Amino acid sequence: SEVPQVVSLDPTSIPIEYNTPIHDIKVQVYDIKGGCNVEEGLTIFLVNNPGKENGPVKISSKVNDKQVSEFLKDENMEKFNVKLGTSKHFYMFNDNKNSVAVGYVGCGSVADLSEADMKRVVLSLVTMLHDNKLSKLTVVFEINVDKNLFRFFLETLFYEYMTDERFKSTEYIKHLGVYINNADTYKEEVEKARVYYFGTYYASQLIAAPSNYCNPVSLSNAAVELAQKLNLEYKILGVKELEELKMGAYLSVGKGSMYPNKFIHLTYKSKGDVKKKIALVGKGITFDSGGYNLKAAPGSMIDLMKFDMSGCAAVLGCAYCVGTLKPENVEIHFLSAVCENMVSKNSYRPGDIITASNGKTIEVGNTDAEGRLTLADALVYAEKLGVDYIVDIATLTGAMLYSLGTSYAGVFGNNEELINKILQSSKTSNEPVWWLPIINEYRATLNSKYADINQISSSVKASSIVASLFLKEFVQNTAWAHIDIAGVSWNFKARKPKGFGVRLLTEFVLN
Amino acid sequence: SEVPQVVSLDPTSIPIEYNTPIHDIKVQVYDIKGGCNVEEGLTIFLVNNPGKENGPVKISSKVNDKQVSEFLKDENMEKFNVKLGTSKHFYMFNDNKNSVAVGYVGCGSVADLSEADMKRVVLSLVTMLHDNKLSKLTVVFEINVDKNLFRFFLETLFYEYMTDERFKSTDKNVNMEYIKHLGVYINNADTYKEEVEKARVYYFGTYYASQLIAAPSNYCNPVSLSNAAVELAQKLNLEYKILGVKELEELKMGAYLSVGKGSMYPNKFIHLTYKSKGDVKKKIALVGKGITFDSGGYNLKAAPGSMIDLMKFDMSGCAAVLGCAYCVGTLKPENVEIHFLSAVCENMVSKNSYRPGDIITASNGKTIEVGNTDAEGRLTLADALVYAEKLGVDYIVDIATLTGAMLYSLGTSYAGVFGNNEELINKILQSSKTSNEPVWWLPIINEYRATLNSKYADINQISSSVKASSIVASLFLKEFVQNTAWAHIDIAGVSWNFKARKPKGFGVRLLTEFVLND
Amino acid sequence: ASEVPQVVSLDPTSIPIEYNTPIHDIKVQVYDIKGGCNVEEGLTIFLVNNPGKENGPVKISSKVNDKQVSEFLKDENMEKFNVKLGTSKHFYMFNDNKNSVAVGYVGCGSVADLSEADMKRVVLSLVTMLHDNKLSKLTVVFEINVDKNLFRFFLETLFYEYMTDERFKSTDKNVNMEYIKHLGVYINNADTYKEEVEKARVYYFGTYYASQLIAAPSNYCNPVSLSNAAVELAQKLNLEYKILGVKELEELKMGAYLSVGKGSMYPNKFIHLTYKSKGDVKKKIALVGKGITFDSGGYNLKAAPGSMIDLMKFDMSGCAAVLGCAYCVGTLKPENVEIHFLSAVCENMVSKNSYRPGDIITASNGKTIEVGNTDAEGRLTLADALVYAEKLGVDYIVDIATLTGAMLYSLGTSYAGVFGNNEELINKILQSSKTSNEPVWWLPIINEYRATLNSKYADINQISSSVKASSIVASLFLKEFVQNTAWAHIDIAGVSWNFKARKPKGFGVRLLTEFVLND
Ligand SMILES: [Zn+2]
Ligand SMILES: [Zn+2]
Ligand SMILES: [Zn+2]
Ligand SMILES: [Zn+2]
Ligand SMILES: [Zn+2]
Ligand SMILES: [Zn+2]
Known part of the structure; x- marks a missing residue:
């Protein structure tokens, strides 16, 4: 709850304007x-x-x-x-x-x-x-x-x-x-x-918040404050609870940060009979320097990486819209394994072998591929809730700028009906999404020589699909879709976030 | 018809084994x-x-x-x-x-x-x-x-x-x-x-295409590649025409000819034709990118990972169309007319090459501001598309190793398909299923077209800001099909089998299945 | 005089050479x-x-x-x-x-x-x-x-x-x-x-001569003018000389050597100076020197930072060393020896006529080669120059070349590397190093890398696709072009140019001469 500081001037909360x-x-x-x-x-x-x-x-x-x-x-x-x-x-x-x-x-x-x-x-x-x-x-x-x-x-x-x-x-x-x-x-x-406007403008507020203001601690505090204003259940998981759960992948990314990992879990439960349980998972990396795989290459845009929690921001804006509209006959879980990916004497390093909360060991090939690590344990957690739909949304792979570009998000999944619902929700929210395939033929490139699975492909360049095949290994028996918003999240021309996903995710819950 | 040479040791034809x-x-x-x-x-x-x-x-x-x-x-x-x-x-x-x-x-x-x-x-x-x-x-x-x-x-x-x-x-x-x-x-x-x-x-059509791809650029050039197609057409008893420079000048093919201005082999435009001895219910035009070697031009492939040494494959699209011509010409389907087209050239560095910033005029009047001489595929395909459209066909389908972005979009297994017509894409998607050559449908995001607005010419060859390269090229090609159903198959990523170090002949069975189940 | 082509009337038509210093x-x-x-x-x-x-x-x-x-x-x-x-x-x-x-x-x-x-x-x-x-x-x-x-x-x-x-x-x-x-x-x-x-x-002038040749820039010192230079040298020294032009080279089926030159405005020229002693001939020696008058890299252009394209007038240092040797031998006149001085001279350039990466070409020994990188043009010319060398029937074939930039990362700017298929020949080279005081150091031809030259289509790859030890892999490549003769290969890429004094070293002239006057 208390936001750590290095000097007395470091800010200790995200300024939020609710009455616009x-x-x-x-x-x-x-x-x-x-x-x-x-x-x-x-x-x-x-x-x-x-x-x-x-x-x-x-x-x-x-x-x-x-x-x-x-x-x-x-x-x-x-x-x-x-x-x-x-x-x-x-x-x-x-x-x-x-x-x-x-x-x-x-x-x-x-x-x-x-x-x-x-x-x-x-x-x-x-x-x-x-x-x-x-x-x-x-x-x-x-x-x-x-x-x-x-x-x-x-x-x-x-x-x-x-x-x-x-x-x-x-x-x-x-x-x-x-x-x-x-x-x-x-x-x-x-x-x-x-x-929908404010739900979108709330997400934009979090995304736009710089990483000194919007860190794992303060971002969980905002989530809690949104739950109370909205009257949703809220449980924030801390490091001790997270170790007891064994989320090795998620904790490794935070090892190098001055802000403890904080896992957000908001719940909206409609008053009547519950006919559909849904888990929404958002990538919540409040700053992604890349870690020891530092974002130093020309074009890597390290100065934009305050936006690597855009998925979390979308899922939270969805909570505002869902809690404000209060739909019937649903139980929605809003999840985000929040952390910060830094270079320190304490960070995980390339080559480390870590153990996810489902027991599978993973060999880290690149520390900037941290988003799929955190989503791995979030997806294990989500499946433990016994939901019908797990939908995650994340600024996962910069490869999407070369497939769909800056207008269309990409969606991957393991169930045709769930991908169908997400597309139709794209038609009614007017947030454009495009269906891309999880090409099975590429799965063998995640065959680790020592660990149970590789974090990344060493050769294959279609990273957006590879990540998708990695995530698939962490959902055993549940319809699951994955929405890569890396290319669409930030409006480069206007120099501001888009708030992408709020309305798309809400329409999915509503219709 | 005669292959120019620099030394008497330069080959003057593609070796082709027909009886394997x-x-x-x-x-x-x-x-x-x-x-x-x-x-x-x-x-x-x-x-x-x-x-x-x-x-x-x-x-x-x-x-x-x-x-x-x-x-x-x-x-x-x-x-x-x-x-x-x-x-x-x-x-x-x-x-x-x-x-x-x-x-x-x-x-x-x-x-x-x-x-x-x-x-x-x-x-x-x-x-x-x-x-x-x-x-x-x-x-x-x-x-x-x-x-x-x-x-x-x-x-x-x-x-x-x-x-x-x-x-x-x-x-x-x-x-x-x-x-x-x-x-x-x-x-x-x-x-x-x-x-x-x-x-x-189906096997030989594919191995045929693979022989043309594997053939090194000194062997397989625009003159010798067109020679090869005329021999194929003569075996199959297809009608054939080879447009040379003077005819291409008369047809006003500025985009196509500009690419080859720097080559030592003159431009050659392949046009084979199959039509059956009954009524004609469907008329198809198949267009293949035919760049026998792609140095990039003055935008030389010198960056790391540009694989200039692989660019003898930049004619796999042409190879696929000629390959399809063998399968169609052999099995001879009923009630169809099929034109197999390819604007063959070589993108070279010379005092005669076109330059970046050059402005050229395509065969349909549209002026073009060249932004990167290595975006030459869309230029040759632009003139080939307007040519195909003049034939009055029902379907224009092109297949090209167009954009390296394909490796980041679908990888090495699936070709991307773009088009202006749901029905044709669906027929390509079905044909992809039955030929067993996988393909995924990608969209032509209209929002990107504005980055093609040139300040001086009618249209930009390339976008300056957008990086979804496959999508932008499809938007450019779209401007040269005025009112015909047209799809675009990008095979930049699937053409070459990197693990085996040999072409796949990708596209031959797909295109044939498209022709035969119509 | 054999006429040098020009673009403008001001283009030099000869290498200026001072003999009376x-x-x-x-x-x-x-x-x-x-x-x-x-x-x-x-x-x-x-x-x-x-x-x-x-x-x-x-x-x-x-x-x-x-x-x-x-x-x-x-x-x-x-x-x-x-x-x-x-x-x-x-x-x-x-x-x-x-x-x-x-x-x-x-x-x-x-x-x-x-x-x-x-x-x-x-x-x-x-x-x-x-x-x-x-x-x-x-x-x-x-x-x-x-x-x-x-x-x-x-x-x-x-x-x-x-x-x-x-x-x-x-x-x-x-x-x-x-x-x-x-x-x-x-x-x-x-x-x-x-x-x-x-x-x-x-020994001074022999080395200073090669130095003059190397420092002569590529517009002054081109394939025609440099072969003309050798002719004059043979003429002053009563050496036998034959200069093979494109016509014979085609007759001789030197497809690897010719391909590298297809993109130049100066036709290929093959130098062959001969010193035969008057006595009973006991040893026959062929010295081969890489003769690239300018190496732009070809379509694999030298554009990467630190590629030093502006230095590539020196890619003919081996040919200069060998001609410098010819001066010493022609002047000193060893008594019981027959020496052939060879150099397949050309120029690696970008044009519509250049050979392309991927091109498959046939060497004068009938072996086909898949070009993986046009900037490795030296091993292509030397391959044909070696076949020609064995056909002469000598006792030793020794080539000297600025072949691989890796040399700067192995032995540096002081010591050259010697590779070969014959311990005794490599010992003679090492011996000549001591007496000439031009440092050479023996490096291995590691046969395990041979497999990475296995082309899927041609007879052999020009370059390895995986092995990074370029200086060794090229040696493996050359070794495939000498079938039954003692052969050593001296890579001087690192030692030829004196970066500090901004001038060439003339490295190799004295090494090679001492070798010629060896027991
Ligand atoms: Zn990252
Ligand atoms: Zn990230
Ligand atoms: Zn190109
Ligand atoms: Zn191309
Ligand atoms: Zn070179
Ligand atoms: Zn060289």
């Missing part, structure tokens, strides 16, 4: 039929031009205002194109001689927008908000979007709009109007978007 | 419900024991010789297990008082053997042939096996047994003695017979 | 130290040691024939100077004839038997006193013990280090260079060391 300006935004959804009102604030239309790549802007909806109508006349809206993500907006006086702001965001030439297109649209939207001091924004949907994509649009606008100043030292809007066809069906999605 | 020793093998399939005759040669039993990891071996088939039976009594076979890949040699005097050789290969503890497990059995089998001078091999199938797994057995056996001595001179392996007959004892032998011919045609 | 005009006199040292004009320098104590005091032992110079060199007056190896002091005084003289000393340490390395350092200190001083005579007095072979080494090393190569200086000539015209030497039993004076002079 987003939560104060009044959101009204009006039916697109009957026309729009432009009586104050910024009014933005979302218009596309199917077929006509880069075609002009044309506004179809009738606005109850003589002056702005004159502005949105086809003859005047012609000079502007629908290039996906392009935008302009103008200030003027309306019928009532009130200064308003009218504009549009180009939604391209495709009709069925993707999550990435939507993201590009929102980015233009937020760009106007951050350089315009208004109190109301109104968005008119002259494009076709389903309920999930609509909810996704709100979540993404909320998340991108929020600016995280916790670590800074030396005026948001208050109303949101949405003009959309079928408003009544879309209304039930607004408050859920608000929950 | 495997071809000289007389295969018969006998019905096991009738006993196995153990006269001469080596006769091998494929046995398993479902249950414990290394159960014991138990011969089930009726052996048509008293002495052998008394020898193969369970009491004698108890000492040996059926560990997958295990084998043992037996010697005895049969009923005729003659010396016979018999043995077994462990088929593991599984009932329905896996493809990868079948291979391991063939290799173990081949090992028994390699240091032995035998005239006949008999194999009794005491394991469950479908027709498709029987053919795959023959197929794999033929390819591994075949030893490529085209380039030996004083190290010709004496003691090499191929068997002359192959006997197969199987249940319902009458139904598996149909697969012997097919396992033969 | 200032060292050829110095008159050498050797005096017996018994009977007195006279102190004439110029500089007089004593070589003094003090066995026992390091940095010990210097005492002048020999008898000087001058009262003033004697009084000045009194032991009590010399104790202020030590004998630390290399130290040196200059003295100035008037003699018996009221004339100014200059004397001094150079310290030779406290060890009894100086090594060639120690002699090198003593000579370097002498040269330092010769530079920036307009002297007409230098005299050296040997108050130290050296055998006949080490005394010759002193003269040659003195001559070599004294020489300054200005062939490529135009506006920056040292307008202050003035060489001595006379050199006196005082030593005990002088009559026995006299015979070494003329051999040392011959």
Whole structure:
């Protein structure tokens, strides 16, 4: 519980903001039929031009205002194109001689927008908000979007709009109007978007927290504080309990750290009959220097490694969403074997042979492959709960930047139905995931000469699949999936976390 | 048609063995419900024991010789297990008082053997042939096996047994003695017979492709590779055309020709055609990357691990298409028209090579900013795709050793497949299942296209920021298929068998199965 | 003259070669130290040691024939100077004839038997006193013990280090260079060391000649110009010579040697100089030298840090050593021997015409070779050059080559490595090393690595894919191209270039010549 320090100035807790300006935004959804009102604030239309790549802007909806109508006349809206993500907006006086702001965001030439297109649209939207001091924004949907994509649009606008100043030292809007066809069906999605937004923004807060602030001790303390605020059971496992359990793999990674290993175990149990038990496991490495296999090669981005607990952050954000929504007929376990991978006289070293909590011995070939070591014991622990689904999520292998890149997470697993559910949850959360195979032919490269199994392949380069084959050895009789978010977790362009997985994991629990 | 040379000692053609020793093998399939005759040669039993990891071996088939039976009594076979890949040699005097050789290969503890497990059995089998001078091999199938797994057995056996001595001179392996007959004892032998011919045609198509890949770059060049295809087309009675530089100039193939500007061998564009003597219901175009050697260009492969010495394989895609042409041209399917295309060149370093930053114009008008001269595969394939599209086909399928990222995505076992059309990918995925050449579907993330927006040309050859290289190349290729169904098979990672130091001929059976089950 | 191709009219068409060096005009006199040292004009320098104590005091032992110079060199007056190896002091005084003289000393340490390395350092200190001083005579007095072979080494090393190569200086000539015209030497039993004076002079130029060739840059010294250089040398020495061009090389089926050159603008040229003695011929010897006039690496370009591509004008040091040898042999004229000097010269370059990694090529002995790395081009040329050598029917084949950069990690910059298939031949090489004072050290041909040359397609791999001991694996490769003849192979990659002085060593000329005049 007490966070160790080297000097008195070392911080002793993660600053968390629970009450954000987003939560104060009044959101009204009006039916697109009957026309729009432009009586104050910024009014933005979302218009596309199917077929006509880069075609002009044309506004179809009738606005109850003589002056702005004159502005949105086809003859005047012609000079502007629908290039996906392009935008302009103008200030003027309306019928009532009130200064308003009218504009549009180009939604391209495709009709069925993707999550990435939507993201590009929102980015233009937020760009106007951050350089315009208004109190109301109104968005008119002259494009076709389903309920999930609509909810996704709100979540993404909320998340991108929020600016995280916790670590800074030396005026948001208050109303949101949405003009959309079928408003009544879309209304039930607004408050859920608000929950998903924060769940995503909470994970981002932890990830963004640097490793001096966000260490194994303080990160478990935040988990506990989230459980109590949410009224979930919470048990934190310490070194003594961890030795008694024999989690050799997990403890080896921490041997070199000044912060004791802390294993997080949150539990949500719905009030009624329990029909499905689920274990969610997240890689929780608060800083991964690589260990004696130091991240010293050009491109190894050691300065980003505060993010190697992104899986844990996702699983916790899921706890917020799950505890806040309080679904029926489930028991969810949120697990994370937290630690820190450092270079010290005390660290485990390459070549060490260690014994996991299920008795299998493992030969360490590379100390930077530590995430699969910690997940190994977390998966043994999880299977001891007698759950139906074990889903882990982790920034495991940098190889994913060369397979799927920075947009799509990869998912591996030992059960077709579980991989199917994760994909469908990817469709409804709009968090993109792609199914990759656990190629059995590669398993023999983990045949250790001395230990029971190798930690890494010495030859095979498809590390994302090799790790998957290693993890498989630690689940004996339970549907299990594995989601490698190493490439998607961090938004390199915006220089901030994405919060990837929260909504994906929640949709998996909910539907 | 004439291969340029620098010295009179430079080879002017690819050595190609068409009548291989495997071809000289007389295969018969006998019905096991009738006993196995153990006269001469080596006769091998494929046995398993479902249950414990290394159960014991138990011969089930009726052996048509008293002495052998008394020898193969369970009491004698108890000492040996059926560990997958295990084998043992037996010697005895049969009923005729003659010396016979018999043995077994462990088929593991599984009932329905896996493809990868079948291979391991063939290799173990081949090992028994390699240091032995035998005239006949008999194999009794005491394991469950479908027709498709029987053919795959023959197929794999033929390819591994075949030893490529085209380039030996004083190290010709004496003691090499191929068997002359192959006997197969199987249940319902009458139904598996149909697969012997097919396992033969599929075998050679693959070994053919492997001969072109293995052929060093000095032997196998753009001129000599096109010469080889014309001979193949002439044997198979396929229509053939070879576009030379002047025609390629007239067709305005700036991307393709720019790659070869630095080679000493002129560009040669292969176009073979098969069409059957009935109505045509499907018209396919198969495109193969045909880079006979890939130095990288001015973006020289000099970084560690770039394996410049392996780049004679950068035409395995072309080899696969020509290989498919043999199988299709031999079996001759009905109601199809198939164009086998390849834009062959050599990516070299010279005062005549194209440069990074160069801007070139493809045959479809699109200007291209070259960002890395070693991304030359997508350039040649761009002009080949627009060429294929002009033919008015239903399916355009290309197969290429395009991107090294494949090793980090799927590894050395599975090829990746990309496309713009679910239906065609599904047909490739099915064909992958039945040819037994594994492939995994990867997506063309549209979000990355923006990193191809060039500031001066119409399109970027490469992305500057994105590292998912296989996906980006697929996005580039996508810009040269305007309205046709098109899939893309990246074989950069599966083409070369690194452990054996020999090509796999990957793609031949896949492409054929695609053509024949349509 | 055989015409050298050019790109522009300014490209040089010949290697500039100086044959009449200032060292050829110095008159050498050797005096017996018994009977007195006279102190004439110029500089007089004593070589003094003090066995026992390091940095010990210097005492002048020999008898000087001058009262003033004697009084000045009194032991009590010399104790202020030590004998630390290399130290040196200059003295100035008037003699018996009221004339100014200059004397001094150079310290030779406290060890009894100086090594060639120690002699090198003593000579370097002498040269330092010769530079920036307009002297007409230098005299050296040997108050130290050296055998006949080490005394010759002193003269040659003195001559070599004294020489300054200005062939490529135009506006920056040292307008202050003035060489001595006379050199006196005082030593005990002088009559026995006299015979070494003329051999040392011959040995100096032979080595300085190879040095000129090596330092000549690849645009001056290319396959055509260097073969032209050898022709002229054979012509001045009445040596037999035949220069095989591409046409014969194709007839001779030298596919390995030709492949390496396919990418050059200078056609391959094969040098073959012959010295046949007039007497009954008892030994026939073929010396083979690696002749790469510039080694870019080929498509396996030298781009890795520390690859020193800018040094690769020296990949023909073996050929230069062998030609330097030919000068000595042609000049000294051994009596009962037949010597063939061979070099398969070419240039390893990047072009559309170059051979590629992976290429399979056929050597003149019909063996096919899979090219795994184009930067290992030397073993390819030597393979064919060895086949040609055995066809001549000699008693010994000895090749010398800057073959493997591993040499820098095994024996370093001082000792070369000798490999071979024949203990007796390797002993003759080791013997010639002692007498030439050019250090060689025997390294093994480890047969266990042979298997890693087993190509899957060709007859043999050019390179091992797993074994890192390049210098051994190449020896295994070459050994496959000599079937029934004693053959040794001397890798000089590490020792050829003198990094400190920024010039070539000419290493191997004297080693090889001594071998030629061996029992
Ligand atoms: Zn790591
Ligand atoms: Zn990590
Ligand atoms: Zn390339
Ligand atoms: Zn390529
Ligand atoms: Zn070299
Ligand atoms: Zn070299």
